[PDB]
């Protein structure tokens, strides 16, 4: 559930950069590509929005 | 009521407002005129005044 979308990304500075996703690798992803799953509450999956 | 307003750019992050006497204006008089100033770090290096 943990969405993080700001109304706008808030560049206090040059100019407000907008909203878009990323694409990188993850521990969740490491352990799914592993082949498996676990339970924690650590900050494993990226803070996707 | 309808009105829009905007904000400055200030990478110094300092700025002035001027508070008008925004109404009818006589002639052959004066008016005292006020403003509200901030200066992040002031003379950062500069000199005194």
Report on the structure:
Chain A has 49 residues and is largely without helices or strands. Chain A is built from one helix and no strands. Chain A has one helix spanning 27-33. The longest helix of chain A is centred in the middle third of the chain and has 7 residues, at 27-33. Chain A is elongated. The first copy, chain A, starts with 26 loop residues before the first helix and ends in a 16-residue tail after the last helix.
Features:
part of a larger assembly; 2 chains; 49 residues; little secondary structure; elongated; Alpha-2-macroglobulin (chain A)
Instruction: Characterize the largest beta sheet of chain A: strand count, sense, and whether it forms a barrel.
Output: none
Work out the helix count of chain A.
Answer: 1
Structural class, judged by helices and strands of chain A? Answer: little secondary structure
Q: Output the radius of gyration of chain A.
A: 15 Å
Looking at the structure, what is the overall shape of chain A?
elongated
Q: Provide the helix percentage of chain A.
A: 10-25%
Described by its quaternary structure, the protein is part of a larger assembly
Q: How many individual β-strands of chain A? A: 0
Q: What letter string, H or E per element, gives the SSE order of chain A?
A: H
End-to-end separation of chain A: 8 Å
Beta-strand content bin of chain A: under 5%
Protein name (chain A): Alpha-2-macroglobulin
Family (chain A): Belongs to the protease inhibitor I39 (alpha-2-macroglobulin) family.
Subcellular location (chain A): Secreted
Subunit structure (chain A): Homotetramer; disulfide-linked.
């Amino acid at each position: 559930e943990d969405c993080i979308n700001r109304h706008n990304v808030y560049i206090n500075g040059i100019t407000y950069t907008p909203v878009s996703s990323t694409n990188e690798k993850d521990m969740y992803s490491f352990l799914e590509d592993m082949g498996l799953k676990a339970f924690t509450n650590s900050k494993i999956r990226k803070p996707k929005m | 009521a309808h009105h829009t307003a905007y904000l400055v750019f200030s990478p110094s992050k300092s700025f002035v407002h001027l508070e008008p006497m925004s109404h009818e204006l006589p002639c052959g008089h004066t008016q005292t005129v006020q403003a509200h100033y901030i200066l992040n770090g002031g003379t950062l290096l500069g000199l005194k005044k």
